[PDB]
Amino acid sequence: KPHVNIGTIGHVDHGKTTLTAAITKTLTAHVEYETENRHYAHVDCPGHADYVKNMITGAAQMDGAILVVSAADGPMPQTREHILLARQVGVPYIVVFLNKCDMVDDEELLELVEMEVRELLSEYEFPGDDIPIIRGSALKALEGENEWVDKIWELMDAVDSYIPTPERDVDKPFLMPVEDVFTITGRGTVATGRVERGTVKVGDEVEIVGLRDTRKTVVTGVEMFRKLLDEGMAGDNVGVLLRGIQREDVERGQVLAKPGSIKPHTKFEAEVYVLTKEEGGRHTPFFNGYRPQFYFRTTDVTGVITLPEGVEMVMPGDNVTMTVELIHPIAMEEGLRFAIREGGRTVGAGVVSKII
Amino acid sequence: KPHVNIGTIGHVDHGKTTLTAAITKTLAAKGKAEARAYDQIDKAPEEKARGITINTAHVEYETENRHYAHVDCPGHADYVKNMITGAAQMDGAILVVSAADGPMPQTREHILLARQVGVPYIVVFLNKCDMVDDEELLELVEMEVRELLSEYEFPGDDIPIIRGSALKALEGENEWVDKIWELMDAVDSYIPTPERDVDKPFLMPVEDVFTITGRGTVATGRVERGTVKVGDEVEIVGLRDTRKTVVTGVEMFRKLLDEGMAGDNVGVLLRGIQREDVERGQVLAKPGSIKPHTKFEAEVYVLTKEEGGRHTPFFNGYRPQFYFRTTDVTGVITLPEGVEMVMPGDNVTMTVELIHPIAMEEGLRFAIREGGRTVGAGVVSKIIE
Ligand SMILES: Nc1nc2c(ncn2[C@@H]2O[C@H](COP(=O)(O)OP(=O)(O)O)[C@@H](O)[C@H]2O)c(=O)[nH]1
Ligand SMILES: Nc1nc2c(ncn2[C@@H]2O[C@H](COP(=O)(O)OP(=O)(O)O)[C@@H](O)[C@H]2O)c(=O)[nH]1
Ligand SMILES: [Mg+2]
Ligand SMILES: [Mg+2]
Structure with missing residues (x-):
């Protein structure tokens, strides 16, 4: 049930x-x-x-x-x-x-x-x-x-x-965040990750979304090491081979997705909670123009924060709606969770509330 | 391989x-592993050693x-x-x-x-x-x-x-x-x-002993290492003086087997042995392969309250039960120089002296018990003669 x-x-x-x-x-x-x-x-x-x-x-x-x-x-x-x-x-x-x-x-x-x-x-x-x-x-x-x-x-x-x-994760449009990209000797380039949603099979077209202009190619292999060939689904850790894709063409932090199903953006509103010192955050507040790292799935991208009209700071343990502008585009939808990090500290937790 | x-x-x-x-x-780049994400190894799942959680x-x-x-x-x-x-x-x-x-x-x-x-x-x-x-x-x-x-x-x-x-x-x-x-x-x-468990010298901890009409005196247990069959010589080691005898049969589900193997729950019939000659907590073993001892050093993890353990410290001379395989034996703890009190959650080296010998060797795990709960998990680190 x-x-x-x-x-x-x-x-x-x-x-x-x-x-x-x-x-x-x-x-x-x-x-x-x-x-x-x-x-x-x-x-x-x-x-x-x-x-x-x-x-x-x-x-x-x-x-x-x-x-x-x-x-x-x-x-x-x-x-x-x-x-x-x-x-x-x-x-x-x-x-x-x-x-x-x-x-x-x-x-x-x-x-x-x-x-x-x-x-x-x-x-x-x-x-x-x-x-x-x-x-x-x-x-x-x-x-x-x-x-x-x-x-x-x-x-x-x-x-x-x-x-x-x-909607079950397997029924959603295919999405796999790229964890790593490397060459298997004697073979070729693989992009690895854990499928987040949907299903993929050899011959499917995918888009490689985020960080750079979107490109589309065809899946030539899906492998779960010593267990499975040709298909993958939500929850699987897989290596994906892609037609015409070298290491220069796919990188960590991009996503593989059903074509058209997700777009890259640099600008969004989010609801953010600022961690306390005791939670691992800093004791200092967020402020306008703060430029921490934003961790979306498998990568982190610098972004500049703007606080609501007439808010100068946000204290640890408080939350606010902030506007963010990233230095690189990232695949994202409304409702996507992210972490905000600076140095080696998680300073904020967020959810994308609106895309601009 | x-x-x-x-x-x-x-x-x-x-x-x-x-x-x-x-x-x-x-x-992975040579086709010899699955590449594993740092964050998936780093955010390790929980495993559950009986009330103890280990990431x-x-x-x-x-x-x-x-x-x-x-x-x-x-x-x-x-x-x-x-x-x-x-x-x-x-x-x-x-x-x-x-x-x-x-x-x-x-x-x-x-x-x-x-x-x-x-x-x-x-x-x-x-x-x-x-x-x-x-x-x-x-x-x-x-x-x-x-x-x-x-x-x-x-x-x-x-x-x-x-x-x-x-x-x-x-x-x-x-x-x-x-x-x-x-x-x-x-x-x-x-x-x-x-070494593989099956190539090691036979060892079975004794769980129970009874008599079977027309068969003989049977010691039950699970084979830990090696193998056993009719005609083998075994020693009965721990708790009393070691005795050697011949296996007269091996049974599983009331039927006689050709052989018992590492993993099997068996009954071993023993030549010339009455029910009072063998007891729970002894081991059957390849002759010479294991010796009985009363004194040892150990490394011990003391459970927290939350794991089911004690809620107060113990001190030098604590005299709980030591559970080796199938049976408890009382022992006295001597704490090392400089260690006077042991808190729930601590790990420490100790010396122990049991009131009866147990078959043991370096590496043997045990529990420390008191009032029918486990308060410690230990490993035998050095036998003291
Ligand atoms: N008269 C009445 N009192 C209620 C009802 N439901 C809850 N209360 C009471 O109002 C108080 C607050 O209830 P509680 O469930 O703790 O509120 P919470 O703060 O929303 O979780 C308590 O005394 C409850 O027992 C109800 O249906 N009728
Ligand atoms: N510069 C450098 N940093 C490293 C190296 N190995 C690990 N680190 C960093 O040191 C920190 C801790 O590494 P981690 O592997 O989690 O340490 P662990 O607690 O021992 O698991 C992380 O920021 C790593 O990225 C290395 O060889 N060189
Ligand atoms: Mg309430
Ligand atoms: Mg680590």
């Missing part, structure tokens, strides 16, 4: 931890649980920076989120912050659990809160008019009341049907 | 993982002569645990020393651990010679490394020391690549090929 990564977002005390427990009983504290047609991994962080860092750099990468909103309070500023963040890091779908409905029985009051949640979701670019809003009480559900346990079921039905099962 | 377990040891940041990557890439990378490659399984580990604590209780004993090690820093404290500790766990042979890769062209400084570092090896009884005058650059080799610079070849020739030549 398919697996999906999700979690709970929304303002402090609105009920994420209780909902999380009520869901598990019915049917960064990780839990797993399953529905009839799907298995779930579920994250519930204890507030503040924990959400920021799981969402920018976490073990999972959320395929959808449950926004918890307390009927008693309405949307608060962390409700907004979390919706904004979700958009920034690429969370593809949101279902809402309107919680604490045991405390608010005026239907008219519930519809007010509902209207405002939808508007707030639509003010980022989520489709506020189509997102499921399930009325409930995680507390009364956890406490066994059949009335409210039923709505945990309704929530999980809405999760099953509205948050699609993510 | 012959298979050999090796690995890279040495102080943090000296270049172990970059060397490991460089070897795989060098041999361990495995690569494989071959030279003209042998197949190598090569281990590399991110942190000093991983090497501690790997060497004392990791899944593969090393048949040899490559000691990486930065020519820019010289020997450092993990350089010493790893040479010391290699000695304590019985690593047969060390070859040295004097790394980062791209940073150091002063011929005075090089020969100084090599003399220090040689002295340090000799201090722990390695043949510091015989040991090969290859001057290279892991980083330049990994980048493809031909002259540095040559030094990877020089290293692999030193590995092939100086690290001996280990």
